[PDB]
Structure formats: C-alpha cells, structure tokens
Amino acid sequence: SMSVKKPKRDDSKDLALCSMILTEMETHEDAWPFLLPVNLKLVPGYKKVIKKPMDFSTIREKLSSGQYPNLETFALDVRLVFDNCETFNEDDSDIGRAGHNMRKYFEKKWTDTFK
C-alpha cells in the first residue's frame, strides 16, 4: 500500500533474458508455424476466428521497441501464440503438435529463468 512495499526484485536483466528465451524459441525446429504472422488473405477463417493474432516476429518487434511494460506482458503474448494455435488446429496434426511442444519448451525456460 502507500509507503509499504515488498523488497525490490532486480528486473534490470529481464529485457535481455526475454530476448534470449525468444531466440531459443525462434531457433527450435518446431517453430516454423509461429515465425511469421498467419497470412490473413490466404487462410480462410483465420481473421474472423482469431481475435488477436500473434507470432514470434511480432513479439520480437514489440520487445525490441519497448512495447512490453514487464515480463508478464511478454509471457502473455507468447502464450497467446499457443492458445491461438490450439483454437485453429487439431491436436492430431503437425501444427497442433508443434504448438504443444513449443508451449512446453517455453514454460520450462520461463520457470528456469525467473522462478
């Protein structure tokens, strides 16, 4: 509350560390469905169904230009990529499997880096 704060967590490396995690997501072999925005002209249904499209290149631009106010808002966009993927793709497809794998990979890096 006013003049009553928990001890200050050092957040000065968060930016760099989020960039690293993102680089590891970008270079994973199963990242291919997620590297670029889904082409909304060429994938019927995507625009209407997915209210908030997100992909790694868009996360990279937001990160690099100071558009994440904190590490939680960064994790929300990453999770959105996988939530979107689950919404549009059957679990039993290459893309569906890609998303499950990438989400697990992300969550572990997240916990090991910050928790």
UniProtKB/Swiss-Prot annotation:
Expressed at varying levels in several tissues, whereas a smaller transcript was expressed specifically in testis. Regulatory subunit of the ATP-dependent BRF-1 and BRF-5 ISWI chromatin remodeling complexes, which form ordered nucleosome arrays on chromatin and facilitate access to DNA during DNA-templated processes such as DNA replication, transcription, and repair. Both complexes regulate the spacing of nucleosomes along the chromatin and have the ability to slide mononucleosomes to the center of a DNA template. The BRF-1 ISWI chromatin remodeling complex has a lower ATP hydrolysis rate than the BRF-5 ISWI chromatin remodeling complex. Signal peptide: none annotated. Residues 9-113 form the Bromo domain. Component of the BRF-1 ISWI chromatin remodeling complex, at least composed of SMARCA1 and BAZ2B, which regulates the spacing of histone octamers on the DNA template to facilitate access to DNA. Within the BRF-1 ISWI chromatin remodeling complex interacts with SMARCA1; the interaction is direct. Component of the BRF-5 ISWI chromatin remodeling complex, at least composed of SMARCA5/SNF2H and BAZ2B, which regulates the spacing of histone octamers on the DNA template to facilitate access to DNA. Belongs to the WAL family. The chain holds residues 2054 to 2166 of 2168 of the full protein. It is found in: Nucleus. This is Bromodomain adjacent to zinc finger domain protein 2B. The gene is BAZ2B.
